[model samples]
Target chain A: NPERSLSDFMRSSQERVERALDARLPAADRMPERLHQAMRYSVLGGGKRMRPLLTYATGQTIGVAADLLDGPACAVEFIHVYSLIHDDLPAMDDDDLRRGKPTCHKAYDEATAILAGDGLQALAFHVLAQDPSIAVPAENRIAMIETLAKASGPAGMVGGQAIDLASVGKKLDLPGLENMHIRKTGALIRASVRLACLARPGLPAEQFDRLDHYAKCIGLAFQIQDDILDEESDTQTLKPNYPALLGLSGAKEKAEEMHEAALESLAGFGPEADLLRELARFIIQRQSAENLYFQSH
Target chain B: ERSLSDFMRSSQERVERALDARLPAADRMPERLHQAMRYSVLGGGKRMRPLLTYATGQTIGVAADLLDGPACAVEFIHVYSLIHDDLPAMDDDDLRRGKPTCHKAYDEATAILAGDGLQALAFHVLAQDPSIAVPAENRIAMIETLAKASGPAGMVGGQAIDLASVGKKLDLPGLENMHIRKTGALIRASVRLACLARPGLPAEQFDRLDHYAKCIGLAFQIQDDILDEESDKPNYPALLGLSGAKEKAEEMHEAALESLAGFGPEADLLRELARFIIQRQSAENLYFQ
Candidate 1:
């Protein structure tokens, strides 16, 4: 029943964020129609919406209204989608597909794809700074901007990507691999939760710190599970993935440990934290469920 | 006689140092990215945007030190746009400001990341830089201003328009619309940001300064088109013909200076900058060539 409830929560949250993105993004019919169309294409109606869900779920635990969370939710997801668009460029991963469709560069030319990503990055910051729905004080808004910017910048996500690029066909020890994943994906995931926490001014420091701990654990767990699922689906030849760095069993053990740690990080909260707890379960369990499907097929 | 040149030199140095200090060290982790960012930003072009910022600040009596953050912030946005613009997928240029473009000097991937990183850094500096010394609300306003100008509806939108308009004939209005968004928005923002630093400036004065910016923004592009005699890319000279474009550029220059008639000697630098915009092609052509 809890599993069913979590699914319901996720479905509703996903729809809410989709509407937010649709309402806020420039309409496809607008001037610069190609760029607008590509922006809409890359952002709407795809992926699990995990980042926005974390943002909304974190807000739920803290009793913040869904409306207040929408801006941060859209902001983080914009950053996420932009990263995907750029990462798929021919110079990067060069993949033709993302989220079961032609990647942004393939659907549009590489120039449009690059501009779309840049536009999205600017939009992300714009939303944090100006979204009327956010309703946070100037200082709090600045805090959100700083958090998102730092996570998206060189010291964080972009830096992680550069590390990943340099590591291709090259060996990375376990710690080195973890370092790469932490920035490439972990920083934004953590920022998602942090943005939500910052939404409520005067949230206790102790609670903030605990939620951050939960975020850190879940972020790594999410990536490790992704690696495990990738390994199950199609083995990569030389990539430094969790399954390759730690053996498959060891990787699973590490993921399980993270899930437990994430749950423990929320132990002080009552039933209000159940959504967060369910999410931590969902991160790891989804992989196992996918593995079963892979094995059966 | 040489005060304007002195002002440009000193202001350029101040911003260059601010940019150099703020950008991540080249030897940092993700060394290649840090290096690319530094290469594209520091030791580069005219710092025209920053000069506008300082000149606007002087017009409003805002301290030069207070202008540095916004100056650096605008330049970062400008430099990032250039890096991405020069990508093989985009303009595909091998050179910029007489040096190898970021993508040429580093690989494409690094150049992309470098541009992305610098864009984020621009917002980061505006939101967090301690020396900006303004009300928190003003800082937020500055971020909104820069973001709006640089985002889809602004500079990026202009780039998309340029790409789409290739090989297409456009009327004078159509060409003006493209340049207004592409190059004009950021030029306006450069001046508008300095005005925001002095939050108590009268609304009418702000409007006048904005008018000045709009006129000069168009004039700047007209001059570039005149210099390049430039491509099928849709330019002023191409649309209006050479003498016609020159006449139009002068028209804008006159209107820009006229906008500042409300102010006194404090506005001189801005007035001079308007003149420089039209004249710089010839001046810079010598240095760049």
Candidate 2:
């Protein structure tokens, strides 16, 4: 959910956030292990957050002058992380290790883990809605809430999983797969974009429309790249994937189509959509052989 | 290729592109806040609510992603719901979308902060936007829509029913009641978002959509239940019988289809969606893994 590339910048950004988030309710020397552990466990572990980058980047280009969109970007990330925590359940993926550490449920009890997810989700929106020091107007805050609700709801990310869990091991066609991913990955990816546009109160209607089209292209392209990478990469975990059905060339071609569409949307401001422009290019060109995640620099 | 939903695709893309462009941490406020906001949102998941907002608006032939302001607003609600669902006290299944759930990735406190941030973010984004169709009061009304849909009567209620019905034998009607509040309320709210976006929706059409919502709402639940039952999937078949469950779904689908009879081809899209859901179920071909 961070900038797709540019890890050094993303890392510094992450570190600052870590410091800021770290300051929440300043450390009390003595504390119960569970709460403390849960906090330390979750925040400390790291991952690239493309969604926030999308939020942060979009807000600047658009008119919402201030950097107030962070809360919204972070909010989506919180939802993303919470889903990961619970998805590791025995009832689900049954994974015991995450980020090379014990899963929340494994480190703690299932009860604590579950509450962590629920409470964390509530916290995400609460922070977005209530962060006092932030300078956003009332209208913007409401929109943030609405966008976030849809991303995490059944029809979107969560809904995709609900269906994915049921659809797994079974075959689904292109439409079915797209439906699942749109809800699963595409939902928030798109939210990250809109969140940024909305972050700036002044983004024109026409511009916002163009941005949405860019988002869909990128969303589909990101997944297409993932599918291609999943199949072609030597480091894959042998997991089932889209290209397994559609074939590597087909997936790559799909990614190209989406990337072209994404670029086409940003034609007016030739270079303004740089990261986005290159972002699409990165999807097509980058060939990391290792299966490592985009680690925070 | 460009149906009523084409705009949602475009709107979503713009939102994403705009996000990447804007918040590169110009200052402290942006830095800390962006971190938190990005933390939850970009991590991963579907972009359903915004898509719905885009699609719903498209249904009304509203051009442009101007609705994206609210589009993102609806999406935030969905994110909030996912956060709650993954809570340790709730559904409790740990894995989500093959990644670490938020609580697992971050501390409960921090995770809590994340959820709170997103909740606030939703309103912040909306109140912050000037391009939305409605006025400030109507924007506030949008908040009411989210709160009402996600509050005790809607998603929360659905959760209550889900909690209450576990291991308890629920007849078709009772089961419907359980999901109606938990799932339907939010689903309806999603559709309502589109309705509410355009000012002064006719009451009769509003009622008609509600009827359709009620049908699809239960259809979502029934299909879920039936999927669980028909497969070897470990689940809550303890709530309903095999055959009875099937018949119950039939009843709801019929009602749901009937409810959509109001809008002609305009409603045809929804009509087909409902049928696809029911038809998929009837195919008895449901499978998770």
Candidate 3:
């Protein structure tokens, strides 16, 4: 499992990033510190840092410092935290376990969970749009915020949930299911890529277009592969997966096709895109319950 | 769960851009919390508070730009009201608007945190919005208007009255007392915040403005009671006959407009609004349908 020395390296980087983020939170009044501590607890606790890594990787590959993506990285994670608490509600999926521990409501209660989700979601935008110093220009910062909004808000994440609850227990066709996943997950993942590309102003048009192509393809691949894992992986022995319906083999085939597409898009950018190409490969070659694999064809 | 990772999507970024570009992040030092404050206040809801802020601001010729912070501030209270109302010891309903209540969506602790965060942010936003750009005293007045609206004297007090009124039976006057604190207090603040956001707002005009807000505030609630009686049981109109309720609303509407007579163009839009608040018998049933 440690064969992923590179991913491990990235993870350690994320850990260091988390510590830095915690250190920077506004300490204001003593009460603000407690709230900040609580905020840090839900967010700074632990996760793949996939979103932050997206911010970092995109920044790094684009020749900007990964640290430059810190605000957006933290923002996306806040959205992720908020969504988790909401989804775990008694009225929704109502799960008690997430990351092998109690969901927010399980440890706290429904009311606190709701507030946490609301605050975290808003906090993400608060940080992104409110940051005083940013490498991205004003208009571009607005663009990144736009990306975050559509990915996370009412029409994107919340809208998708509306549709899911409406469609519950009703059998869905493949296209219908895909539509749901695209809104729920696809939008945000693509936002992550868009955020990275837009992190630096004046990205060449062609390079920008290349990143867009790569992002959309990979987003789909990521979803289809989740479908595969859900069908194949054991719950206790699971990596984050999506196997509630389609069987194992079918999910795997879908995954392979997606990865192929994701890699092909990476090729159009030339050698300048080698980091992305390596990322594409790394997505599939890795393994572990904690590790997430992507196949965006 | 919201299935947020695999369940949500939209046109990608259009609506978000509109929302952010309009209200862009602020840097008010102790005031920078406006954006976070807006996260709750300006969040999606019935848009009732916003309509009030705009209507009252425009009535006084305040216009929209100068009115943005105040309009958003009222929404902050509206959102806070919704947040607190949904708590476990409160209304306790699991669903709101359409989605799972904020509490049901996140966790109770997080929802409370969100509420507390939103309240602080609301004041932060009104006082700090770079858009206000007015002098410290003017900005301070706007902040005070909002503070009064949000405190026990306003929306919070109203909510307390509501909690007490849920099970017990009350006459028309009794019901009116409960709602005045619950619904009318913040409604008035919405107007006051808008008026005060402007510099050189004449002190002499304050009384008329209060009367304008008070009239419509109570009338608006009476109208809601009528609508609820029409739609469901357990409403004030149900207790007070339809004619009696309608007559009360008309009286309240009359009083609301008379208070504005002292002001000129500043209260024009609000005057028309007060008339509309009670005159439009079909607004609730028709426009909504």
Candidate achieving the largest DockQ? 1
Error of 2 at B275 (Å): 48
Q: In model 1, which runs have C-alpha deviations exceeding 4 angstroms?
A: A232-238, A287-297, B230-232, B281-289
Question: lDDT tens digits, residues A1-297, model 1?
Answer: 455556778778888999999988998998899999999999998578889999999999998998899999999999999999999998999999886789999998999999999999999998998999999889999999999999999988999999999998987887898889889988999899999999898999988889988998988887888888888877656478888888999999999998889999998799999888878877656634344334434
What local lDDT score does residue A142 receive in model 2, on the 0 to 100 scale? 69
DockQ of each: 0.87, 0.06, 0.05
Q: Worst 10-residue stretch by lDDT in candidate 2 chain A?
A: A24-33
Interface RMSD of each: 0.5, 10.6, 11.1
Candidate order, TM-score descending = 1, 3, 2
lDDT of 2 by residue, B1-289 (tens): 2443454356557656544432224243223334534555656544544544555565565554457666665566566567656766666545576666666665343344445445545555555566666755566666666655654345654564565455666664666666766667666766676676677767776666677777776766666766766656112244556676677777878887786564546655566556654565334424324
lDDT of 1 by residue, B37-125 (tens): 99999847888889999998888889888888999999999999999999888888998767888888889999999999999999999
TM-score of chain A of each: 0.93, 0.84, 0.83
Give the best candidate by lDDT: 1
All candidates' lDDT scores? 0.88, 0.60, 0.60
Candidate number achieving the greatest TM-score relative to the actual structure:
1
How should the candidates be ordered by DockQ, best one leading?
1, 2, 3
List the candidates' TM-scores in order.
0.95, 0.51, 0.57
